[PDB]
Each structure stands twice: as structure tokens, then as C-alpha cells.
Design a protein around this ligand. Sequence first.
Ligand SMILES: N=C(N)NS(=O)(=O)c1ccc(N)cc1
Length: 1724
Amino acid sequence: ALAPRQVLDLEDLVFTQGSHFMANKRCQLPDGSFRRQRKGYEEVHVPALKPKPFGSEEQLLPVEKLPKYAQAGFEGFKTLNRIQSKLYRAALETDENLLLCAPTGAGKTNVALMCMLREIGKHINMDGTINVDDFKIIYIAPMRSLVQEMVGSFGKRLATYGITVAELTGDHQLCKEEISATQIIVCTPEKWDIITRKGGERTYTQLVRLIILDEIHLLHDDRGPVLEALVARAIRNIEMTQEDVRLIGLSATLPNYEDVATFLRVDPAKGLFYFDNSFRPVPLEQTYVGITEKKAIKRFQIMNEIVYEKIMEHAGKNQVLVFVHSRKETGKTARAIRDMCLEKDTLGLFLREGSASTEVLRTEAEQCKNLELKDLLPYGFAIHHAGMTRVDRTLVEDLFADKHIQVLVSTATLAWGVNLPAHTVIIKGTQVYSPEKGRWTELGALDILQMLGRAGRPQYDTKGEGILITSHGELQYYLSLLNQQLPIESQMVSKLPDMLNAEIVLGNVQNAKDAVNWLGYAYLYIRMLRSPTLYGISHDDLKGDPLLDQRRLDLVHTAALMLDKNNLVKYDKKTGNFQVTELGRIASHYYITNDTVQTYNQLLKPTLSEIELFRVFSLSSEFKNITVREEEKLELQKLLERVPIPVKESIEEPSAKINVLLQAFISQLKLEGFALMADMVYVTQSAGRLMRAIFEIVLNRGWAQLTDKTLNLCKMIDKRMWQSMCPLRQFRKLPEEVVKKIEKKNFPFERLYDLNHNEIGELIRMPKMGKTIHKYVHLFPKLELSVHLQPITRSTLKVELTITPDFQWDEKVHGSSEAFWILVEDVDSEVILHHEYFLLKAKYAQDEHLITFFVPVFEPLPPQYFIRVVSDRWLSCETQLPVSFRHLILPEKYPPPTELLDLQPLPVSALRNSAFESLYQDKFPFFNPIQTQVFNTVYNSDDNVFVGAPTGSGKTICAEFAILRMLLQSSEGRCVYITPMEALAEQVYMDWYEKFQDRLNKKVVLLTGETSTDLKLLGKGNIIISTPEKWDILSRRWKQRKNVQNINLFVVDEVHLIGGENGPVLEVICSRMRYISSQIERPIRIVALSSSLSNAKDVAHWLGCSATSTFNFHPNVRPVPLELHIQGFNISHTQTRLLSMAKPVYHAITKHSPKKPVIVFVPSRKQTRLTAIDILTTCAADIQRQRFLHCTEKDLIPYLEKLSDSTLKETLLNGVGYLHEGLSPMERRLVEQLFSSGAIQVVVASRSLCWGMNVAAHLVIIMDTQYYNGKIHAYVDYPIYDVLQMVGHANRPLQDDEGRCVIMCQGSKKDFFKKFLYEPLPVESHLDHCMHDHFNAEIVTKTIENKQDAVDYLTWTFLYRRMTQNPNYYNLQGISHRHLSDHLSELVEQTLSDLEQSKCISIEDEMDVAPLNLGMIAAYYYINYTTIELFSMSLNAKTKVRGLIEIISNAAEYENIPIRHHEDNLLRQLAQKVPHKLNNPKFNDPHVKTNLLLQAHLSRMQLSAELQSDTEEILSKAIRLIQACVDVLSSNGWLSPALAAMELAQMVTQAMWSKDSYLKQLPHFTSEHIKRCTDKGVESVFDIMEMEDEERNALLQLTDSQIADVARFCNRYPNIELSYEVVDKDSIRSGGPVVVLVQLEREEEVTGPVIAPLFPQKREEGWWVVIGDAKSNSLISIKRLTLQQKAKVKLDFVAPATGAHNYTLYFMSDAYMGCDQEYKFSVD
Ligand SMILES: N=C(N)NS(=O)(=O)c1ccc(N)cc1
């Protein structure tokens, strides 16, 4: 972006005066102007503008004529203004941008209220009052008092609608619970500026529909720029969001209004309104005076003379008000008026001619006041300023509204924050004091205009009188300010650098080019275009650049050079690109000037003292022109000794002045010099932001001591107290005296925790205060800290800090939340090696919290680290914990990785078989380096090999390599491929089916999970592939299963998932395969593919891999090089961090792959949709439009014509695809196909899909890297394996010479990612935590029998190898073999005891153990022992279907069922729809969630997509669990419970409740036809299949495809007749075996599987035969069977004594409802 540009002296082009850069050469005094000179005391008097007619339809509109709802806001008014009528039409009936130029006091408020009511009534419900969570309105006001007046009045007006208005302007910040529950935010421009330059501005700006800007003439003021800035951002955002917001502007009658109309994007014909002062609310006659020379006495006395004359002129029923510029001047005015009244015969008295009483009566009666109120109130006068109480201020205001107070002198605050008008207004002088300029200046425009607009009460005056007193040399200017002739200019050039940085930091300006465009968005651009001479531009240069390219480029270049000098931004001369500094980011977010940044960066140091800290604070360039006046030096010397910090920096120069003023603010020391008070206030209202800025600067750098100093200084400024004082001062309902008494005694605060209330009262000598002191002591926040550490590597330790609360919560004291900083410091407490922002919410305030993070350690290992948790707001609220590293081992360091040499790549010709080459020659001509190296050992050496290489580097085909010789050595061999994830298994199954059974014609299958079907598929396949669970349940019985023994090849992929959840299953199945290879004496070849592991040798020796077969490569030695970019976001609240990272993903796309494909991963599905849409709208804003679409819309139309999601159609035809599990697999494969084709450039995917997508990009972006766990009501970091898979998705060697990935994460995590992603990953076993189930399952198979071989088994585990090299990770404190064996024996003992207490095993002596019924059926159904124990203890003799479902939902396998954000609310909603209602339900409990899901499924209820996937996950194991329940119910002998359990099985199959019609089971059916049938006679499916064809088809009244789909279910319906015989019936007596034989016939053969559309897995008929006694509720015998036409069943059971033994024979199903039989019989 090279272009000619020259640096500029911005001082020449800036209007130095500001506020009043007089562009008006001469003010044309109106008609009726006379100038009576009196040598000073001149009177340039203009008349009141006479009224105007109502000619052109103009009329005061009746409030009843308004739209009916909007009449609520205008209640109390029976009409509205003329301006208000024209604007009623415009504003209430249109959404057009508006700009109202009207004189001061003309109304303004009510027209903005109409604009608000537009939006308020847009979101109406039919009978719901409003949609508060849908629209957010804001109101920008120039002064704080105006903000407060506005929020009060607007609340009063529109409370009827149910809206909530509030003020955000205050010294507090980062507190935003009110922004959530307030629909109309009133704020100052700089407030909204600091809010909307914060990252994640959308959190506030998302629901913004209406932006009002009151008193837009602020553009001329020095505060002008921020306004511009605001508008610019807003407008640009309404372009980037494509969500229109309405801009309302309110200005006074001043010129250049058309330019701000262009600025505000108002149509001059539709939204531009201008009213000259003939539309003034009360016609105003004004007089201006001048001063002759410098005579203070003369000035003040002449002011007083004018005041006395004009006040006396308005004696009765009139109020002549006076405005002063200081609180020392209102008292002086009262004094002077009273005195010169007295001096001249005390005349003017009895202004209220009812001297006896009237108003004097009420004044004296209400006289219980202070200061100068009690004397001037009966006299008739009054004063009003900020240094008064609320009661007395409101009392003066009331008695003035009562028109009983006559004269009132006040300051500008009354004119801004109170609706208090008067007949006459006298501006006493116009010189005010500015601490910013450090000098006396002239007043601002807004003050003068608001004050002189107060003249003339609205309904009580026919004419007003404004009187202004100033100097002569200013007259012509004030004449311009009050007669529509002072032009509005732009002060942007002086504020250009700062502003520019705020846009560089905000990411809205990445180059100088969009900087220039932004400058075009400003008011400065328009104002330069239409008056270039006063902006430094010639009329010829305007011809050269009509769009002013050169001037805007020069300006942004100067600002960028300034920001580069001060190091807020790095700016390169050539490309014109910007790069943000953390200095600049802090400067923007904390609203501080770049010179201050430079001073900080050159002065702040880790060894800085608190004295030097106060000095640096005083050197801020916000105070660079403050002066030490002689009139205050003695008071400064007095304050210096009364403050604690030395202030050695100087003597009595401005830095020492600032310092001592701040310390007098902290110490609450009173002052006397009024200029000194003004300067103090000006320093203190900024000191908070300045100190927070310094604190962030030092925190990010890790400097610990300065961090503590600075945070404490922030809190001392906030709470108005030093650290020497007692923290009890922070409770503001405590006395000052009592806390001073506590401080007098040298008893530290902490010991009050361990003290009686009576002993407290005795210590303080105040017994009555002791109870409340104890209360507040236990209300003070204190945290308990507990730590669990486990080494990960010699450089990194995993820490699990457990934060426990230890105080009473009070919403008044602590509010909705309490913030904390977690800090990890080294031994010297110098360097902060890690830190985090913790937040204790109010709801979970008493729950325990767990914080996992990682710290670094380097040898020589220090004795201990420190972990401090320090409150962000409370002083002396720190809890420290030393973590000792004295008994900590450092894990055995890993060796270097197997180097990949630069060897000639092997072409496909090395693979000699032509059919084998066929597949690999159609893709690539030669192999990549790592697979060229691994080829020798894998495909041609029958060695056990482990290859470790980054994800996506093409390691999969390496397995194929081995497989090749596999198929070469055996005809119909048996190889087993094991992958941890299911979706990866499905992808590799499709690929290898295409590669083998469809190409080589060798049967390749993937195990489905059902026992019989999977064991059948086992024998067929030459290649069987599976997940570790389906393979575990098959291989656990490797004695009876012959097929699992003759396995030529076992390949396990992604073995590094041993360390993740569901990892112990992989570990045990691999160890079992190794043990089988040992026993069979036929060495099963093992080949393992994994990521780059550090401890790859351990897993290599685990599987018998020689070092000639270990292939573990440094992750840098990828086939495709990768450029990783970790990018931190120091933002806590994740819902706002996502909105912040919004724009960075677009800028990352444009930076790292502007044309090439990208994948961006997000933590949700709604996030996939939203990210797709926001990328779309940003590309529309840039008008790139087709940047992400590389084909034609007509090319896609046929494809997208079959997609069901409308937004997916739109986003796809616009270039970007989204992949979320809320849509069909067909849509997923379609989007993947379009992406890999090149038509779709970018795809945004849910995290859950990072395993099952066969899609490669050039750039992989990751968002957030956190997801919400609602079981702990917090956010969890991603598993490292997921993000590593995502990163591996970035390397494709098809096209690119490089791979690019950027991860966007909270700062707390950044370091973490970096390290573990740049170097190999250490992995360990979690088998010791999930070991009991495998012992319970291998006692059943007799593989384990005693304790010694239970120890022998662990030798096969990876756990055995890892417990040695990393002891402390498994909490063993030794590395000798003694420690190993001791830990193993303790583990086996613990597991066996836990299993015995569960009634699953029996132990005898100390060796031999034996299975029990519970453990046998727990291993038979692959069910956890806890679930079986719970089943056995909970199932009672009389358990009904409701209790059946309850006990089912409590299973441990359903604890994995998660709880996500806002999901507790959805479960609350579902609780009232399900037929059975459980009391005392906790809605973050997975078990009540599963119960609700089961009740909704049985009731055939549709719900969310995530909840549907969860319902599928539960239904997968539902039948397993209910079969286990049937078995234990049989083993305990209860009859009707087991019958109800079989009923529950067949209920969960086809989603039928227990007592609904059986007709509900056939498909294509709703309740109306079952109502017709059951009312007319058809009650069962047998009635359906008994009817003739035509009478049924007529009874159906359905389509021809419906009858065809009904017939298939009516045919699959089992039709079985039973045959039962009691063998040797005549030969039966007591105690003898009784044998009942049962036989079954099925007319049709196995036509197909069980038909159940609402069940995900295709099941097969399972039947149950039962012998029961219906009276004893006794189940005698039972058998489950699988039926194929012919059956033969036997049931043997003993007999009791002779009696009426009437038995029942039950035939139950586990699938269908209504095909169950009950036959009574008798045997004696
Ligand atoms: N970045 C780290 N080390 N921690 S943080 O939670 O992300 C964080 C949060 C907020 C602020 N202001 C700074 C930092």
C-alpha cells in the first residue's frame, strides 16, 4: 500500500480554542437591536421573536389523536407541541433517521420519547405487554446530571408499558447486571465509548435498535470527537451486521446542521427538521453586556447592580434566576445581593408582599435546614449546587415549584439535572476554571444554551428575559451562539491518534486504507469537504482530491507515526499495516492518552516502589498542564505532612501537587482552596482508570510485587481508605468511631474471626456493637484453598486448585457476584508464572469450585511455589497457599524422536502387486517422507511396529501397508483394526469397503454392537474394524470365541487416546490381545499408529515394538509444514468472548488464506449458524460478496434443492457451509462434498464433528476452546485430543505448500496450548480409576482366579510401565520395585473389596476369588458393577413400571449424559408435560434428565436436536439395562415386577405407554383413527388383520403408500401358537423335579429385523418364557430365547407339598406390544 504521503504538524490544523472556534466572521444582529453604551454595562438588546401562525395544517395534536398505545407516555399532557406534531407524524410513523434542530427547551424530550415508542410498540404481544428481552434502546446525553434527570423522567413516563430505564454512567465499571435487565440505557458519550470499544461490544450492541444523540452540538466541543467515533462505529456495524438501527439526533438552532444531517444519514426531505427561534417555547428578549477594563471591584459591583435592577423589575409572581460558575460564587452572590439591598435603604425587601405570611409562612414552617438556607429562605432567596444534601436540594426545588421561593442562584448542574424554569435568567460572568487546561477559560456552548433556555417557564410565562454578563471582547461571539450563527465544527484532529488507536485495537482498522475509509465516516470529512479553507486545504487541492484521499492519508499517517513512537501500535511505512500492542489495547480499553502510555512504558519497572508508583501516577499526561499556584502552596505543604507516602519526587512542582491531591483523596482530608478542590476532583475521577490501566500493564508482564502494589492502590482509591486502616471500613453501615477504636487497639483484623461477640464488645468497650461487628466480620469474603498437583513432564505440572467459600453471602454487601485473581508466583514472589480471573456467582456461592491449570518448573527445583487468591474489589482479601515441591519426583525425561532423514521418496512401483498399486497411483506418484521411511519396516517386515506422527499426516495407509502383506499371506484371513472414536471407524469402514470388498472383493466389515450379529460378521470379514467397546465385549470371552484367537494382524489407530476418557477400555483390549498372542504361541503382529508422543518408548514396549520399529517423529517433522498461531483473548465471560472473537476469525481468513479453503471450529451448533451468518454479513460489508464462492449459483441450485434447512441454503449459495449435528447425515456429506470440490471455500463446524468429517483445509481456526458443563455450572477447557485433531485438519498435501492454524482462546489457557502443541505430547493411563469392571468381567471368564495372577495381569498394562517413570501422577512416592508391588497389591485389594461389597465376587483366604450372580450378569451385559449393586438394592418385591423407569434412569452409564447451557430451563419446561412427575428434582442431575427424556419418548414427544441425540444415547443401553433388571428380578424371585420389566422393554422399543392402545404401534397413525376404531369396535391389531381387505382399507381412509406401510408391520407382527407339556404329570409328588417343555412355531421365516422406527438400533426378536404362581407372586423358572420358526424350550423346577398349585405360563416379548400369552394350568 505504497502511496506518497507527508508528515503533518497537527497543531496547525486543530482549532486550539475548541468549543468556540469562531468560524462566523460577524454575527448579524437581528432586527430590533439597540446598543446603549454606558462605558462598560453596555446593552446590545434584541427583542423577543413574535409568534407565528398555524397556517399549513399545523396544529397542536390532541393526545387522544395519537396512536392509542403511545398515549400512555404523554399522559398528564392534553396536547403536544407544534414541533411535536410534525415530528409525531415523522417519528411515530416512520423508521427513518431523524435530526431535529430546535431551540433550547422547545421540547425535544417528548419527540425522542415518540421515537422510543416506535420501537416499544413494534415489539407488542397480543396480550403479553412487551418483549423486554428483544429490544434495547439507548440515550446519549452530554452531562451526567442530564442523564439522571432523563432516566428519572423517562421511567415516570413509560413505566406503564413495563419498560425499565437506567443510568450506566458512574465510577463503577465491569458491572453489567443492569445492562442485562434495562431496556433504555442513558449514558454519556464517553461512557458509551469505553463500553463499545471493549472487546465483545456486541454483548451490549446486539439488541440495540435505537440510538438517540441529544445535544449533538457537542461535536463542536472538545468532547466532540467521541460522538463522531460512536456514530462511525455504529454505522459501520449496521453495515457489518446488516441489522438496521435508527439514529435520532437532537440539536439546538445552530448552523452547519445540514452537515450533521449528512453525518447522521438523515434524508433532508424526510428526517431533517429545522426550527428557528420563532419556535422558541417562550419568546425570549435577551441582553448582552461588556466590560471596559481590568477592575475587579467594578466587574463584581456592576454584576450585582444589574442583578438588583432586573430582580426588582420582576417583583411579584416572577423569578429572576442567577447562574454562577462556582460554589464559592453562589454564596458570594447571595451575600452581595443581601448586602447591596441593605446598603441602599434595605429596599427590595418584601418581595412577597404578603409579608406577614403567604409564602413566608411556609418558608419559616419548613425551616429545618443547614448552611445558608435558613437565613435566605424566609428572606426570599435560595442557593443550589452539588455540595448539598438530597433533602435540602429537593426542598429548594419544591418550594421554587411552589413559587414560594423567589430568587435562586445556582450553577450549571441545576440547569442540566432538574426541570426548574424561571421567568428571568441572569448569567453572572462567563469565566470558568478548567483543570484539564489548568487555567480559567470561557464557558462551553451547551452550558450557555441550556442556561439561557431555562428563561421563561413553560406554562406560566408569556415572555422570558435572558440576561448575559461577560467581557466586551466576547460579545460578538455570544451573539453568534444564541442567534443561530455559531457554526458547528469538528475537533477530531487533536484527538486523531488516540481515536485511531481505539480503532486499531478494535480490529475495525487493520491498514491505513480502512483507516482512511473510517476517517471518511467521520464528521471531520463532511466538514472539511464544505469549508476546506478553515481546515487547511486549498481550493486547488480539493480539485486534485475531491474525496480528500491525500489529506486523510496524511492524517492517518501522522497518527500512526505517533502511535508507533509511543509503542501502542506497530506501523510499517511500506505496506501501511497496523499491529496492535498490548500497551495500545490497555490504552484503548482504559481510555488513556498515548503519551501517558510512553511515560509508563519508560518508567514502570518490577522493582518500582509505592513512592515511585505515586510519582509515575502524577506524571500522567492527563495532568501535563496542571500548575502549582501560589494561592494554594501553603495548603499543599499542610497536606503533604498529613499524607502517608513520602512524595520525595519534588518540592512543590505539579507532580508533587498531583501526588498529594491523590493522597488527600485517599485519606478523606478536607480542603479549603476551591481551585484545589476542582483539581483534586479532576485527578480522582481519573485515578481509578489510570491505576487499573497500570495494574493490567504490570499483570500481563508477570511482575508480581508491582502487581500487588497497583491492585491495592486501585482498591484504596475505590474504597477511600489506605491499607493501614482496618478492612471493616469497607462496610459502610459501620461507624467511623467504632472502626477507629478497633484500629486503636493493635489486635489484627483476622483474629476477630476467632472471637466471641461478647469478647468483641469487651475489646472495643462497646458491648452493644459486638453482635453487628461479628455479623460484618463473617460477611467479609474469605476463601479456602486446597491444591492437588500431579507432574506431567519435567517442565510442566498439572495443578487442581479447589476453591472453597468460607463466608456468609449477602446480596447487599457482595451483590450478584464477587471477582478474584488467582496468581501462581515463584519462591521469591517476583514472577507471576500463571494467573486467572475467578468469579464466585451468587447462586453457586456455597458450592465448591475446581480450577485446573498448569505451571512450569525448571531445575534446580525450588522448595515451594505460592498461590494467592486476591479479591478484585476488597482490600486485604487475600488467601495464600504454599505448594511444597519437596516430596515431588520429576518424571523420567523422554528421549529424542526418531529422526526422519532426507531419503529419496518411494514411488508406488515399490508395491509390486498391480492391483495393489491401482488404488495408490490414482492419487499420488510417490509417498511422503515418513511413510517412505515406515514402508520398509511395515509392509515388508512382519515386526510389531508403532508409528508416531502428527494427526492428518497420512498414517492411516501405513496400517493398509501391513494389511497388504496380511491379505498376501492368507486367503480369507482375519485382521482387526481398532479405532477409539465411532465416526472415525465409520469413515475408515467406508474407505476400506470401497478399497477391498468393492475393489479387491475381500469382505470388510465394521462391528455393529449386537452380540450375535457381530460374532457372525466376525467370521466373514478379512478385515474387521471396530471401536474398543464392541471389541472388548467380544474378546473378553476369548476362550469360547475361536475367531478372536486366529488373528493375523491387530492394528490400533490413535492409540494416544489411552489417556483420554474411554481410554482404559483401549488399554485393556490391547493388553488382552498381547496376552493372547503370548498364549496362542502364534505371534499376533501388532501395529499401532498414534500422534507424536514423548513417552513413545513406553507404549512401544507395551506392545512389543523393537526400537527398529518405533517411529515417533517430532511434530515439527510433519509432511506438510504447519504455522501455528496461538491468539489470546483476556476475556472471562465466554458468551462475550465468542462475540469478541467474531471479527478476528474474518481477519484471520483474509490474512492466512484469502482464497484457500478454511475450517473454523466452534463450541456449539447455534454457534456454527451464527458464525456462518456473521462471516456472510462481513463479506457483504466488505462487498467482497463472492470471495468465498468459487462457482455459480446455478451450479449449486440442483444440489441445494434437496436441503431442508433454509438458512443452510442461503449460507451455502453465499459461499459458507455450516456443519452441526442438528441436521441429517445427507446434508453433512453434501456440505463436505461441496467444500472438498472447491465451490464452498469456508466451513464452520461444531466441535462434536471434528472426528467424523473427511475434509481438509489450508487454514483451521479454533474458537474459544471451552465448552459449558452444567453439572458443575462452569466452563471446561477442550480435551487436548480434540484440538490436536482440529489442528491436524489443516495439513493437506494435495495442493498447499504449507498448513495454517490459528487458535483463539482465553488468555488463562494460551501458554498451555502453545507448549503442548509445539512439542510431543505425554500420555498416561487412567486404568486404575476404571479397573473394577474388568476384574469383575475376567473373574467370570476364569482368566483371573487369585491375587497373584491379578497382579500378573497388570504387567500387560500400560499402567505398569507408567507407574514407574511418573510415580506422583498415580500418587505413589517411590520408583523402586518395592513401591511398584506395594501400589499394585493395594490397588488389587481395593478393587476386590469394592467388588465384594457390591455382591459381585467372593474372596476366600487371600488368593482365590469367585464370581457371583450379580457380577456374572454384570459382565454378561457389559454393565458397571455400581449399576448392578444399585439395581439389587433398589428393586423391591413390588416394583411397578414407574419405579422401573426411575431405577433405570439412575444407572451409572447415564451419568455421562451431559448438562449444557440454558438446558436446565428446557428440562424444567419438560417436567410439566411428562405424565409422571417426580418430586424433589434437581435439574442438573443427568438422571432426572434421562427420566424426563424417557417419559417424553414413551409419550412420543419431539424436542431439541441435542436432547434427541441424548435420547438416542440412552435408548442404546436401555434394553441392556432392562434385561439385567429382568435377570436380577428373576434371581430374587419376584413375578409381577419382572412382568412389568418385560412390559417396560417392549414399551421403550416402540414408544408406547403402558395403557395406550396397541393400535398406536403400527406406523403412519395418529390418535383420531384410533379414537374412531376403539369407539366403533376395533381395539387391537388382530381386529385389523381379521377384517377383509376393502372394509379395512375403507376404515383406514389412507393413501396407497400408507396401507403398504401398515401391511408390513401387520405382517412382521409375530403370530405364535404355544405348546406346553408337563413331562410325567402322573409322576409328581413333593420335592420331585418338575419339567415343563415348551414349543413354538412361527408361520413366516426371518423376513427382517424388528420394526421400530423410534428405536435407533435394528433389534431382533427376543422372547421370554415364564412359570409363575399368581398368588405367591413367585417366579419359579424363566428362559430367554431367540426364535427362528421352530423352538424347543425346557424348564426344570422343584415342587412343594401337595395342594392347589395353580400355575401360570407367560410368553412375553422384548420388542412388540400385544403378542404376549398367558396360559393357566395346574400340577399336583
Ligand atoms: N490472561 C490471563 N493470564 N488470565 S485471564 O483470565 O484470561 C484475564 C482476564 C481478564 C483480564 N483483564 C486479564 C486476564
